[PDB]
RNA sequence: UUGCCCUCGGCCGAUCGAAAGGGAGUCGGGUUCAGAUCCCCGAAUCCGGAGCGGAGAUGGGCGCCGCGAGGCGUCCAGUG
RNA sequence: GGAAUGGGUUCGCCCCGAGAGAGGGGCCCGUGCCUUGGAAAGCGUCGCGGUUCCGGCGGCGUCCGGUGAGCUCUCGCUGGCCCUUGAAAAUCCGGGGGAGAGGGUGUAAAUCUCGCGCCGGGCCGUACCCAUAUCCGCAGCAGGUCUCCAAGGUGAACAGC
RNA sequence: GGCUCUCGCUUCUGGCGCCAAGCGCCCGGCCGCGCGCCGGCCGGGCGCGACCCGCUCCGGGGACAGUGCCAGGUGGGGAG
């Protein structure tokens, strides 16, 4: 019953966690940004061609919401390939362009043929 | 005994070893609400409390109040669940024979200042018990005087919460006895005689008994030290 | 902005194991490493507080 | 890991405020029509998280066996 | 170790029985040089090919010295000036202390700021002009608009030529 | 011991100082124990240490200051 401090501090009180009687939302929101929304369409420009032929990297236009982890995960099991690196930029028209460099064993030219880029 | 053990006393002098963890309860910076209720208790002692409010400081002593509650326990108001039992039982049992048996409603305590005030005015209250800690005190500050005027004995008791427990509520400003059973008539009479001498018969001096007007311990101590100095002077004059 | 020097004076804290640094107006003559004493029972010396 | 309790905790003041202040750690060569310490090649590094070594640490005492070396028992050490 | 017969020393100072000089050593920086990187690459030059829009393939070379009140940057040392004394915080580290923790002689234990290995680093900006034509001034306006780099000659000199 | 006043432990030194020693109480567990006294070991809490009581944290003001509302003066500071 001894107070060894000249200061009175608010006692620590129990704080219960929420146990709602009803969820405020009936159902979880559907993930709008899925693998198909992440990848919009591959870029098929001369510069993108050089990237496919030389750097073994594919060029995609992707959702601006998506990040490198999502882009890598989307490309990985959309086209059933492995991805080594993802470099993203936002082009002046507001789109996000992703340079997706595949693993060395995968061939970008082969994958471009299956996609339909060339 | 191990020779390695030795005393290591600490010198708690000024400039010496760090002071111990002493009890600082006296010097704690309490919250505003704790300071407010404490300073209010002091203002009641410091200020001149008029006799109408001050008379509630005179409460029944411990053994009388315990005796009073012992009798009042026998006349506690029925709980709503207890009343429901009484009813179903009365309705079903009286259905078998003759339903029309009003008989007599047994005696019971009457609670609430409004119920008691009317009972006193009609002289139907044999004994009125008022809590001493009613706030606002206006609710009962007239009640001791009113009981005196109608000649009904009244006693002030410690704790509105104590009265509230009789009537199964949190608090109760006052309770009143109107009727008691045959065996409790003697027990009630002894209490009424003791209470009447304490409160009703003494009400002339209660009306003028001002309270408070007591200075705090430090100021009174300075006053006593000055009085000792004045006494030293009186002793020198005698010499 | 002040024409008078200030003295950083370090005292032990009475109630906690901790050093307390105090900024004093420097009385002329005090020097670094000098002990200064503050209290009712301190001695009448330059820099002491009484 | 979880809830409780004890112990200790001044957060002596939320928060915002610098693309010139403070602030870990990337450089060389090559490549485009236009990019680059950002791409490619090569060589590093910082920060964050959870295997193999190495260190800690293998010292001394006394008896016994053994040509000896070495081993055995047993006690005492060991945060370089 | 012990200095006056004072000595050491700078452009200037300044330093010394509170330890000069002299001898031996310790620490910090290390942007320089050599090495791993590394010559394989770059560059110069002379050739030979081709898929003639190849990071093409070869040969040889990429050397040896000097100088400085030079200039710029950088790092130190040492002063002067002030009634002017020239941020804070994030963040990181060392020490004092010693509550603890660790195993009983081992296939040791807690433990480890040593070496190596494994995994990861999300988001936004990044083009170009930056000005006698991409900015403001109604304009490709003699105005205005914050910086870094800075060769040879003459000469005191980012003067002028 | 009676009555009063004062005092409570720190002043050669540019060191250190917290997270209780010690005494006392009680509760235990474990292992022996010779069936009997209990002991050893391993601990846990507590009081003293650090006195008791008390109604404002301490100190300085103080029914003044101040504030609220009137009243008179001053008021090119400002307005017309
Ligand atoms: K900044
Ligand atoms: K005026
Ligand atoms: Mg980017
Ligand atoms: Mg901020
Ligand atoms: Mg900056
Ligand atoms: Mg460019
Ligand atoms: Mg070569
Ligand atoms: Mg220089
Ligand atoms: Mg240590
Ligand atoms: Mg650029
Ligand atoms: Mg112009
Ligand atoms: Mg101009
Ligand atoms: Mg305009
Ligand atoms: Mg020049
Ligand atoms: Mg010139
Ligand atoms: Mg005017």
UniProtKB/Swiss-Prot annotation, chain B:
Modified residues (N6-acetyllysine): 7, 70, 190
One GO-annotated biological process of the protein: maturation of LSU-rRNA
GO cellular component: cytoplasm; cytosol; cytosolic large ribosomal subunit; cytosolic ribosome; focal adhesion; membrane; nucleolus; nucleus
One Pfam family per UniProt: Ribosomal_L7Ae
Principal location: cytoplasm
Gene Ontology terms for molecular function: cadherin binding; RNA binding; structural constituent of ribosome
Cross-link (Glycyl lysine isopeptide (Lys-Gly) (interchain with G-Cter in SUMO2)): 21, 70, 98, 218
Entry annotated with the keyword Transmembrane: no
The entry's keywords: Acetylation, Chromosomal rearrangement, Cytoplasm, Isopeptide bond, Ribonucleoprotein, Ribosomal protein, Ubl conjugation
Record's subcellular location: Cytoplasm
Annotated signal peptide: none
Domain of life: Eukaryota
InterPro entries: eL8/uL1-like, Ribosomal_eL30-like_sf, Ribosomal_eL8-like_CS, Ribosomal_eL8/eL30/eS12/Gad45, Ribosomal_eL8/Nhp2, Ribosomal_eL8_euk
Disease involvement: Chromosomal recombination involving RPL7A activates the receptor kinase domain of the TRK oncogene.
Function: Component of the large ribosomal subunit. The ribosome is a large ribonucleoprotein complex responsible for the synthesis of proteins in the cell.
Oligomeric form and interacting partners: Component of the large ribosomal subunit. Interacts with CRY1. Interacts with DICER1, AGO2, TARBP2, MOV10 and EIF6; they form a large RNA-induced silencing complex (RISC).
Family, per entry: Belongs to the eukaryotic ribosomal protein eL8 family.
Protein name: Large ribosomal subunit protein eL8
Organism annotation: Homo sapiens
């Amino acid at each position: 019953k001894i107070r060894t401090s000249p200061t009175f501090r608010r006692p620590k009180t129990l704080r219960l966690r929420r146990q709602p009687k009803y969820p405020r939302k009936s159902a979880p929101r559907r993930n709008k940004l899925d693998h198909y929304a992440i990848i919009k369409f591959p870029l098929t420009t001369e510069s993108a061609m050089k990237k496919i032929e030389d750097n073994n990297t594919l060029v995609f236009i992707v959702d601006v919401k998506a990040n490198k982890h999502q882009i890598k995960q989307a490309v990985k099991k959309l086209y059933d390939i492995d991805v080594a690196k993802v470099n993203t930029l936002i082009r002046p028209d507001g789109e996000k362009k992703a340079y997706v460099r595949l693993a060395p064993d995968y061939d970008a030219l082969d994958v471009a043929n299956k996609i339909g880029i060339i | 005994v191990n020779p390695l053990f030795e005393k290591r006393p600490k010198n708690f002098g000024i400039g010496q070893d760090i002071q111990p963890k002493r009890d600082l309860t006296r010097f704690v910076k309490w919250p505003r609400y704790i300071r407010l209720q404490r300073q209010r208790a002091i203002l009641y002692k410091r200020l001149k409390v008029p006799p109408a409010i001050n008379q509630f400081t005179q409460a029944l002593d411990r053994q009388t109040a315990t005796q009073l509650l012992k009798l009042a326990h026998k006349y506690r108001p029925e709980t709503k669940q207890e009343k429901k039992q009484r009813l179903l039982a009365r309705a079903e049992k009286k259905a078998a024979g003759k339903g029309d048996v009003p008989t007599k409603r047994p005696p019971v305590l009457r609670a609430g200042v409004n119920t008691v005030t009317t009972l006193v005015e009609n002289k139907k209250a044999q004994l009125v018990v008022i809590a001493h800690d009613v706030d606002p005190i206006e609710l009962v500050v007239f009640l001791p005087a009113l009981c005196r005027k109608m000649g009904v004995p009244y006693c002030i008791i410690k704790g509105k919460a104590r009265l509230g427990r009789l009537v199964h509520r949190k608090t109760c400003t006052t309770v009143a006895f109107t009727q008691v059973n045959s065996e409790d008539k003697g027990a009630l009479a002894k209490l009424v005689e003791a209470i009447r001498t304490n409160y009703n018969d003494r009400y002339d001096e209660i009306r003028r008994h001002w309270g408070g007007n007591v200075l705090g311990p430090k100021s009174v101590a300075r006053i006593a030290k000055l009085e000792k100095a004045k006494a030293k002077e009186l002793a020198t004059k005698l010499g | 902005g002040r024409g008078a020097p200030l003295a950083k004076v370090v005292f032990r804290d009475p109630y906690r194991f901790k050093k307390r640094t105090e900024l004093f107006i420097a009385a002329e003559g005090i020097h670094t490493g000098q002990f200064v004493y503050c209290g009712k029972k301190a001695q009448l010396n330059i820099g002491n507080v009484l």
